[PDB]
Amino acid sequence: PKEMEEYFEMLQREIDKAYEIAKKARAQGKDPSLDVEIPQATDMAGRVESLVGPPGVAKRIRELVKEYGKEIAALKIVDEIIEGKFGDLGSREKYAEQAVRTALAILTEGIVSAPIEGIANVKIKRNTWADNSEYLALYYAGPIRSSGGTAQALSVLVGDYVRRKLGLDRFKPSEKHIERMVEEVDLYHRAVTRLQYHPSPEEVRLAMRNIPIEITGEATDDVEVSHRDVPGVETNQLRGGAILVLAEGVLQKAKKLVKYIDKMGIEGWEWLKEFVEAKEDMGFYYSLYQKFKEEIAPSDKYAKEVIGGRPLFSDPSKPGGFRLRYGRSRASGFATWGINPATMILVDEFLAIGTQLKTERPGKGAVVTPVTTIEGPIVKLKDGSVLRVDDYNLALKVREDVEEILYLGDAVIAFGDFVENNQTLLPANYCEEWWILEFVKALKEIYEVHLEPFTENEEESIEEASDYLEIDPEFLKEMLRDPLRVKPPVELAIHFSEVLGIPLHPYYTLYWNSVEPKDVEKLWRLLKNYAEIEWSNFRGIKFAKKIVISQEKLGDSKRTLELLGLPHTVRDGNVIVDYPWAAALLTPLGNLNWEFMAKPLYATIDIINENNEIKLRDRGISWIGARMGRPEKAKERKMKPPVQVLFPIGLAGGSSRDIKKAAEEGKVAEVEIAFFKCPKCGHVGPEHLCPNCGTRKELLWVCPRCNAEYPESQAEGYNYTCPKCNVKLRPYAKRKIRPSELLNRAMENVKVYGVDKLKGVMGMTSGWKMPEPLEKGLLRAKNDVYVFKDGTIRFDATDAPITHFRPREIGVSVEKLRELGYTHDFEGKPLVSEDQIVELKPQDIILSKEAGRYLLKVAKFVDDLLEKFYGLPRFYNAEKMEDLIGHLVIGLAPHTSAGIVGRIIGFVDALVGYAHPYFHAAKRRNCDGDEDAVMLLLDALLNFSRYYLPEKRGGKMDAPLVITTRLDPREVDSEVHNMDIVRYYPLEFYEATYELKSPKELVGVIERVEDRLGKPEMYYGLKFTHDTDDIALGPKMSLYKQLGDMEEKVRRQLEVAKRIRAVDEHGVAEKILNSHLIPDLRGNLRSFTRQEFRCVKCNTKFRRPPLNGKCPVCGGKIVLTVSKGAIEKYLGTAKMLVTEYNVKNYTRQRICLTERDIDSLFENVFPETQLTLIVNPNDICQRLVMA
């Protein structure tokens, strides 16, 4: 209501404070422009008006959006521009281009760069071959490959709408057009990329023959088609940008596209809609398992390929894998999973905070976060004992003795992930958050006492309930407050189940349905005959306290105890089950009072419930599969060769483009650069201020034909065209520069003399070829920071979500938080302690410590710049990373042209960037493996310029052309609108899971972010289900990053697979790996006999080596492009995999023939001349042949 307004006012105040200094510095004339080059917006209309224009459209956009919506407003704006009420523009194509750009900016919220980069040109073409009638064609460049399916589809749709409104005929191709398009699709798939999608030829034919526009563009790849010289096309190469929009755009997003069309009320696409429509007795648990297998079938698409070094953590839907839990933690929910740190530790630290893994059920991909309120693995030690490693320290302690991982642990997956991907709900395993609801309901129904979990209750109700149940009121309050951490003792749980009539507490339930009733029958017989047990009493309830049975008598039933997840120990040839876990096993079996007998068409829990008086629920029925990929990252950003100043040097600096070295040797460099001329005296050089008089200079325009030089004032009168010729001038020309004088002047200017290296660029890629001042480069070199293409310093890190935090996790005092603005905790009580949970504001971020270490250097560089180059007071004044708290940054995604402002409040000790889910959505990012940048606001304000951007096509991608100062959840994204914000899932959800419903049938029972849109409470109150002790607890670096060799990687991965019981290494892992080494072996062997030799001095490539033996027209030797060692680098690991594991004979023979083929090719060039002292190095090929 008012706290949000105060927050946004403070943000604007700080932004103004930085902008004033940036404006003051830039007005001295030491930079390409006399003002800052990053305007600030406030909403979608401002971003659209800035990025594409035309001027004044912001008001119309706002009013139309408030009246109708978004799509209707976009189309009405299209019509308004077409009628031409914003000023005369010119030809028809100009009107069409402007309308399509503005509309596609309006529909995508004006963040992605598709309107500016993807669309290269719109033109009108005539159907010359058949009718000669007009039609519209859209030229698509390379950067359209990044926009997204929705962006491509909406571009196609808006082009179709504009061409319909322009009175143009439908596009009408020939048959050769269709054939060429099919061949292009096939060539792109088999030579460039898999496209993550592959429509059938008939589907593509339908689309191409039904698409009313020409989807074309310039060439992008070096491949030529066979259907050459097709009319109407000015190229015979692969036009990737033209086919991507067809494949992954309209075709791959048919449902969303048709929904959009229906919303817009435009017809003519009924064929696409039709295409989408065409695309469209026994025991209780026995039946439930059957139905579950029938409806939700296992999926395998995630494990179709395993790379070397990236382990597989579970087989598809195999018991013993990841136990599904429904919930959302403090720092998970957007697309991430919650994992216990003990499971991270006990898999050899292959999993670390922020590591991506390719999942199976809900989506494809997620990021792992530590949750300490769920369960960890159950392991079997080397002496035969079973343990429950639910703790981080215990996992660290017992890691060496582990022999098998009986169970892997839980995974917390949000309900909003199932709604997004449209996945049928899998049955829910029994847990504490379900038991507590059943407990409360039964208490109310039997005694008429009202209580609520996860909150605070009235004292009178607590006293009544405690008196009825005869327990401590304080214990009742504690258990109702945190049911996930406080559990009753086993005898008390049995007493509750006796009195109220509810299943046994899920903590003392074993995995009964993981064994067959016959095994339990055998075990019952053994326990009844040869076991010694000690009994107890509690309120008239008898329970076991200890079981001792000899190992020889127990026999092969010890595996049943291990598969039930029962902790025991072995001592002196006996197996002992101790206090909490003797009743866990003997109470369900009736304390050996009724015999256990197997039945057909029944499960273990069914028999237990049919015969016993205390009921049980299936503790584990749903499992998930996952696999490792893409370790985390919190590293900086550098160019391919690192750069520190945007100054051209050529080859005068060497391979490393060292400007200082070139300056020292008195060399002279010739490069294309822009010169400026002082109006008063006549100094000429690559500078913006004249050293003699210190007055701003003017750019020199040069005629390419006669080399006449014209100042900026003169060229304006001539319209930038030479008088003596009729050709356009240029702002630059090839010129000679002496690095020594310039570097000495810069050194004298900033008083920085000790810099040893100063890297530059070979040549400038912009169309102005303006250089950057050398003083900035010297200061950057001194402070050890690097520059980016647009003149900014950036830091890249993986992103994770967070909505609530503890002051102790991020190392910030309560007084500092109160100064920043935080006053309460997420329950309304005042903030007085560092153990309380405080809700995060939408635009506050939590950096890592690597980010802090780098941004300290960046802050020092900015302070030095302000003090030395500009002569202004310093700004940050920081000595440690915690002096940056309260300072602003800019977040930017690599595929967008707009940024958003954020504030620093603390640091963690992981390799991820934590932030609100709204913050990541505002950048159009999904939070399941994506990486984004951050930069200090003042650095970008001072340094960023629009004259340094490459001119190729996508020089404007990944650049802050505009920044957003406020956050609006209504226009950030659409995947974050499905997140759930309830404190706990209701009982109805749990009961409906057993019916295998779909999430859409119960979308109104669980509150999501969508339900609150529009109302003031979309920044105010959001909640979570699962708590966490620490948000950065667990391993911080993946073990994959410290393995050197490929053989070592494969060995460690295979050992991990051996340990886990639900992976089945022995042949599946090795076969799927061999189908990653065999392709390399065979491809390199084939490519060796048809290679292309190259010259080591030049880069010219010859089909076959010169007869002389040395490069003619050069003074260098001839080298290979496919060395001999490139073929056989993975042969040792392949032979190890074939000889150590159980693979099919086909693969073994393939490897054994590959070795012979490698040996036989080089028989006449590398004869086997060296004899050996000993033979038989455990070869498998020779043994196979001999057998």
Partner 1 sequence: PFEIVFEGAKEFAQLIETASRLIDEAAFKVTEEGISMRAMDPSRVVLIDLNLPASIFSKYEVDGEETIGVNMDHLKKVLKRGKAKETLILRKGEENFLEISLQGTATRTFKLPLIDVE
| List of residues 6+ apart from 1125 with CB closer than 8 A | none
Query: Residue 104 CB, nearest distance to DNA (Å)?
Result: 24
Q: Determine, following the binding rule CB under 8 A, whether residue 1172 of this chain makes contact with partner 1.
A: yes
Q: Determine, following the binding rule CB under 7 A, whether residue 744 of this chain makes contact with DNA.
A: no
Q: Determine, following the binding rule CB under 8 A, whether residue 1175 of this chain makes contact with partner 1.
A: yes
Could you say which of partner 1, Zn ion, DNA, none residue 1084 binds, taking C-beta under 5 to 8 angstroms by partner kind?
DNA
Number of residues that bind DNA (CB under 7 A): 35
Q: Please give the radius of gyration of the chain, using alpha carbons only, rounded to the nearest integer.
A: 35
* Spatial CA neighbour of 296 closest among 841, 997, 855, 916: 997
Residues 170-199 that bind DNA (CB under 7 A): 190
Q: Determine, following the binding rule CB under 7 A, whether residue 1082 of this chain makes contact with DNA.
A: yes
Query: Residue 1135 CB, nearest distance to partner 1 (Å)?
Result: 15
Which lies closer to partner 1 via its Cβ, residue 516 or residue 1045? 1045
Q: Determine, following the binding rule CB under 7 A, whether residue 1078 of this chain makes contact with DNA.
A: yes
Which lies closer to Mg ion via its Cβ, residue 930 or residue 1065? 930
Could you say which of DNA, Mg ion, partner 1, none residue 926 binds, taking C-beta under 5 to 8 angstroms by partner kind?
Mg ion
* β-pair partners for 799: 913
Which own/partner pairs from 16-22 qualify as long-range (CB within 8 Å, at least 24 positions apart)? 18/875, 18/888, 18/937, 18/938, 18/941, 19/941, 21/866, 21/872, 21/875, 21/938, 22/938, 22/941, 22/942
Query: Residue 1177 CB, nearest distance to partner 1 (Å)?
Result: 7
Measured CA distances, 910 to 332, 355, 633, 796 (Å): 15, 11, 10, 14
Residues 237-256 that bind DNA (CB under 7 A): none
Element housing 1057 (H / E): helix 1046-1059
133-141, 171-179, 245-253, 1168-1176 -> range binding partner 1 (CB under 8 A): 1168-1176
- Token look-up 């250089």 returns 771
What torsion do the CA atoms of 44, 49, 53, 54 make, to the nearest 10 degrees?
120
Measured CA distances, 663 to 657, 671, 687, 906 (Å): 11, 15, 17, 44
Q: Determine, following the binding rule CB under 7 A, whether residue 300 of this chain makes contact with DNA.
A: no
102 is written with which tokens?
């503005």
Q: Determine, following the binding rule CB under 8 A, whether residue 1167 of this chain makes contact with partner 1.
A: no
Which lies closer to DNA via its Cβ, residue 629 or residue 811? 629
Q: Determine, following the binding rule CB under 8 A, whether residue 1187 of this chain makes contact with partner 1.
A: no
- Interface pick for DNA out of 1045, 1055, 1157, 1159 (rule CB under 7 A): 1045
* β-pair partners for 709: 702
**Footprint of Mg ion (CB under 5 A):** 926, 928, 930
Three-state secondary structure string covering 796-843: EEEEEECCEECCCCCCCCHHHHHHHCCCECCCCCECCCCCCCEECCCC
Which lies closer to partner 1 via its Cβ, residue 713 or residue 1172? 1172
Which lies closer to DNA via its Cβ, residue 562 or residue 1128? 1128
Which lies closer to partner 1 via its Cβ, residue 130 or residue 1173? 1173
Q: Determine, following the binding rule CB under 7 A, whether residue 1147 of this chain makes contact with DNA.
A: no
Query: Residue 902 CB, nearest distance to partner 1 (Å)?
Result: 48
Query: Residue 1075 CB, nearest distance to DNA (Å)?
Result: 5
- How far is C-alpha 27 from the geometric centre of its chain's CA atoms? 41
- Interface pick for partner 1 out of 130, 1173, 1186, 1187 (rule CB under 8 A): 1173
Q: Determine, following the binding rule CB under 7 A, whether residue 1072 of this chain makes contact with DNA.
A: no
Residues 595-654 that bind DNA (CB under 7 A): 640-642, 654
Which lies closer to Mg ion via its Cβ, residue 127 or residue 147? 147
Which lies closer to Zn ion via its Cβ, residue 38 or residue 1111? 1111
Could you say which of Zn ion, Mg ion, DNA, none residue 1045 binds, taking C-beta under 5 to 8 angstroms by partner kind?
DNA
Could you say which of partner 1, Zn ion, DNA, none residue 1098 binds, taking C-beta under 5 to 8 angstroms by partner kind?
Zn ion
Q: Determine, following the binding rule CB under 8 A, whether residue 1174 of this chain makes contact with partner 1.
A: yes
* Spatial CA neighbour of 777 closest among 759, 803, 804, 799: 759
With beta carbons less than 8 A apart as the criterion, state whether 892 and 919 touch.
no
* Angle, alpha carbons 101-104-108 (nearest 5°): 140
What is the distance between the alpha carbons of residues 1187 and 201, in angstroms, rounded to a whole number? 49
Element housing 1018 (H / E): none
Could you say which of partner 1, Zn ion, Mg ion, none residue 1173 binds, taking C-beta under 5 to 8 angstroms by partner kind?
partner 1
Q: Determine, following the binding rule CB under 8 A, whether residue 1113 of this chain makes contact with partner 1.
A: no
323 is written with which tokens?
């136990």
291 is written with which tokens?
């139905």
What is the distance between the alpha carbons of residues 320 and 314, in angstroms, rounded to a whole number? 8
DSSP code string of 859-882: HHHHHHIIIIIS----S---SSGG
Q: Determine, following the binding rule CB under 7 A, whether residue 754 of this chain makes contact with DNA.
A: no
Number of residues that bind partner 1 (CB under 8 A): 6
Reduced to 3 states (helix: H, G, I; strand: E, B; else coil), residue 469 is: helix
Q: Determine, following the binding rule CB under 7 A, whether residue 655 of this chain makes contact with DNA.
A: yes
Residues 1088-1127 that bind DNA (CB under 7 A): 1091-1092, 1094, 1096, 1099, 1101, 1117, 1119, 1121-1126
594-602, 860-868, 901-909, 1043-1051 -> range binding DNA (CB under 7 A): 1043-1051
**Ramachandran class of 237: left when φ > 0, alpha when ψ lies in -120 to 50, beta otherwise:** beta
Which lies closer to Zn ion via its Cβ, residue 1086 or residue 1117? 1117
Reduced to 3 states (helix: H, G, I; strand: E, B; else coil), residue 532 is: strand
Which lies closer to Zn ion via its Cβ, residue 268 or residue 1106? 1106
Could you say which of partner 1, Mg ion, DNA, none residue 655 binds, taking C-beta under 5 to 8 angstroms by partner kind?
DNA
213 is written with which tokens?
């526009």
Verify cis geometry, omega within 30 degrees of 0, for the bond prior to 54: yes
User: Binding marks (x or -) toward partner 1, 110..129, rule CB under 8 A?
Assistant: --------------------
Which lies closer to DNA via its Cβ, residue 654 or residue 1067? 654
What is the distance between the alpha carbons of residues 389 and 386, in angstroms, rounded to a whole number? 10
1050 is written with which tokens?
């494969």
Q: Determine, following the binding rule CB under 7 A, whether residue 167 of this chain makes contact with DNA.
A: no
Q: Determine, following the binding rule CB under 8 A, whether residue 1169 of this chain makes contact with partner 1.
A: no
Could you say which of Mg ion, partner 1, Zn ion, none residue 690 binds, taking C-beta under 5 to 8 angstroms by partner kind?
Zn ion
Query: Residue 1175 CB, nearest distance to partner 1 (Å)?
Result: 8
What is the distance between the alpha carbons of residues 650 and 669, in angstroms, rounded to a whole number? 7
Which lies closer to partner 1 via its Cβ, residue 1106 or residue 1132? 1132
- Interface pick for partner 1 out of 537, 877, 1089, 1170 (rule CB under 8 A): 1170
| List of residues 6+ apart from 1095 with CB closer than 8 A | 1101, 1102, 1111, 1114, 1116, 1117, 1118, 1119
Which lies closer to DNA via its Cβ, residue 872 or residue 1072? 1072
With beta carbons less than 8 A apart as the criterion, state whether 256 and 250 touch.
no
Query: Residue 1125 CB, nearest distance to DNA (Å)?
Result: 3
Which lies closer to DNA via its Cβ, residue 206 or residue 1122? 1122
- Token look-up 């006012």 returns 9
| List of residues 6+ apart from 1051 with CB closer than 8 A | none
Q: Determine, following the binding rule CB under 7 A, whether residue 1132 of this chain makes contact with DNA.
A: no
List interacting residues with DNA (CB under 7 A): 190, 640-642, 654-656, 1044-1046, 1049, 1075, 1078-1080, 1082-1084, 1086-1087, 1091-1092, 1094, 1096, 1099, 1101, 1117, 1119, 1121-1126, 1129
List interacting residues with partner 1 (CB under 8 A): 1170, 1172-1175, 1177
